[PDB]
């Protein structure tokens, strides 16, 4: 069980940790979060009371270093940092725990929601999508744009998701124009799985990161990405049975975790009616179809 301590909380902020969140008051005594389950990536994120503009946050894996949060009054945000001095870090945490100034990462033990959302996500792959190599952790915020969004403008601050475009040449074999455009199996299986992702887990990892980034930060590119990765599967007639089943679970937990008041913007009407009711896989997402109908029949 690891800890992300905080120097201080100088400004009123709502704090987020994986799917949880709590309100911290201006200079309230608060020195971090304890009891973080080792073994998963984690995200810790922020929405100032004053400027609800800009949700931001940091992906991190406690197995990859000692990380703490310190407010930077010049740039105006809570910044994640690494302590290299392994023994200096223990004494700081122990002092804050003995004074009981940390909130406990509140895992109920029947609950695998976080595992189920982060199944295939790996810090190593996050860092390629978000490039900032001097840091073991990865900053994300709402305004960041994707590589495909910049081709349609600062390259350093981009999300490098895998570009998918259905009306492209990567995607469409000469002379199969119709076959490949109505049945994306070529693109999914040969281009993306075999050529680029190598396996279905790397694909699912980008897919899951894409949705979380959209959910937690309101990153539009992230959402466009997640929708795109779904549609490509659902519009492919030849998809391994194990992927269809895996995808029905992933989606199920994503749709389960979405804030209800946020569904009118986060979910694209066209993509979902198409996947659920018209695509090759209209009959392959039983649990995702079920929850979408119990809980969001309106969009449909």
């Amino acid at each position: 069980m690891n800890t992300v301590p905080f120097t201080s909380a100088p400004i009123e902020v709502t704090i987020g940790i994986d799917q949880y969140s709590f309100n911290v008051k201006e200079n309230q005594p608060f020195h971090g979060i304890k009891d973080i389950p080792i073994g998963h990536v984690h995200v810790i994120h922020f929405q100032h009371a004053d400027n609800s503009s800009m949700r931001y946050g940091y992906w991190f894996d406690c197995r990859m270093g000692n990380f703490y949060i310190q407010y930077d009054p010049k740039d105006g945000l809570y910044k994640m940092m690494e302590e290299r001095d392994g023994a200096k870090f223990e004494n700081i945490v122990h002092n804050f725990k003995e004074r009981q100034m940390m909130v406990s990462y509140p895992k109920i033990d029947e609950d695998d929601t976080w595992y189920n959302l982060t199944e295939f996500v790996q810090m190593d792959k996050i860092r390629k999508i978000v490039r900032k190599d001097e840091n073991q952790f990865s900053y994300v915020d709402s305004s960041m744009t994707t590589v495909q969004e910049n081709e349609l403008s600062d390259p350093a601050h981009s999300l490098n998701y895998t570009v998918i475009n259905f009306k492209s040449r990567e995607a469409i074999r000469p002379g199969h124009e119709m076959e490949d455009f109505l049945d994306k199996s070529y693109y999914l299986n040969t281009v993306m799985l075999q050529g680029i992702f190598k396996n279905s887990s790397n694909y699912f990892g980008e897919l899951q990161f894409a949705f979380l980034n959209a959910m937690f930060f309101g990153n539009y590119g992230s959402s466009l990405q997640w929708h795109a990765m779904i549609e490509l599967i659902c519009s492919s007639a030849t998809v391994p049975k194990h992927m269809l089943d895996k995808l029905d679970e992933i989606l199920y937990y994503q749709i389960k975790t979405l804030p209800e008041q946020y569904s009118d913007i986060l979910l694209n009407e066209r993509v979902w009616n198409i996947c659920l009711y018209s695509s090759f896989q209209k009959n392959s997402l039983h649990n995702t179809e079920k929850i979408m109908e119990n809980k969001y029949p309106e969009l449909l």
Binding site: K167, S168, R169, I172, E177, M178, F181
Partner: protein, 237 residues
């Protein structure tokens, strides 16, 4: 973007463009089976590809053999249009390739756009206009070459005959549409008009009679009367 009555003169500027209409690409004769069911029998069709500035018609003939053993013919026909249209462009010299292609039906957009991925500088565009190009098969010479074909075939026409010698493209296109609209609304009367007088004749290299200027005026009025006509008979006005 799309094409409507505001940017209507853009057709006749000096950017090369083509209209593609797919209405007559897939044509059938729904009939009864011995079992009292209904079956289709396909007959030859054509892709109607037109340069509105020059009047050149690239009439690709679609032989019923292309449909043999295929499924979902309506949808295939749109992909078959797009493939033939892209082949036509590819065969053209660069300096003759269009800068736009405007489809008369929004469902050709994606098929063409996929076939033309290699031509990024060519804009595939829809239109809001209710153009009557579907009636291109009420033109005897055109219907004749299509039904006689025994194989795929591309035949060239000037759909304006010689009109450009005397009038501008704008006016010629307007004559054309007026004429096809009338064929679309009441084919029989539209044709009685065109051929009531046996002294007027269709030149061998033409599709329309050789009307004097004053005769085209008498014809053009009778066609408007008809279109205003059938609009009453149909709307009881």
């Amino acid at each position: 973007g799309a094409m409507n009555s505001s940017n209507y003169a853009e057709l006749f500027n000096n950017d090369i463009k083509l209209f593609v209409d797919d209405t007559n690409v897939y044509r059938v004769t729904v009939h009864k089976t011995f079992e009292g069911n209904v079956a289709t029998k396909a007959i030859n069709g054509c892709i109607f590809t037109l340069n509105p500035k020059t009047g050149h018609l690239f009439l690709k003939i679609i032989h019923t053999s292309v449909w043999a053993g295929q499924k979902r013919l309506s949808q295939l026909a749109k992909w078959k249009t797009a493939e033939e249209v892209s082949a036509l462009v590819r065969s053209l010299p660069k300096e003759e390739q269009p800068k736009q292609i405007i489809v008369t039906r929004k469902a050709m957009l994606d098929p063409l756009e996929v076939h033309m991925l290699d031509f990024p500088n060519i804009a595939i565009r829809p239109t809001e206009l209710r153009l009557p190009f579907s009636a291109a098969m009420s033109i005897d010479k055109l219907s004749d070459v299509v039904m006689k074909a025994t194989e795929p075939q591309m035949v060239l026409f000037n759909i304006y005959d010689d009109w450009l010698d005397r009038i501008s493209s704008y006016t010629a296109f307007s004559r054309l549409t007026l004429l096809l609209r009338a064929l679309k609304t009441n084919e029989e009367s539209a044709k009685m008009i065109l051929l009531s007088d046996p002294t007027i004749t269709i030149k061998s290299y033409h599709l329309w009679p050789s009307f004097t200027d004053e005769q085209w005026i008498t014809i053009e009025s009778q066609m408007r009367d008809l279109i205003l006509t059938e609009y009453g008979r149909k709307y009881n006005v």
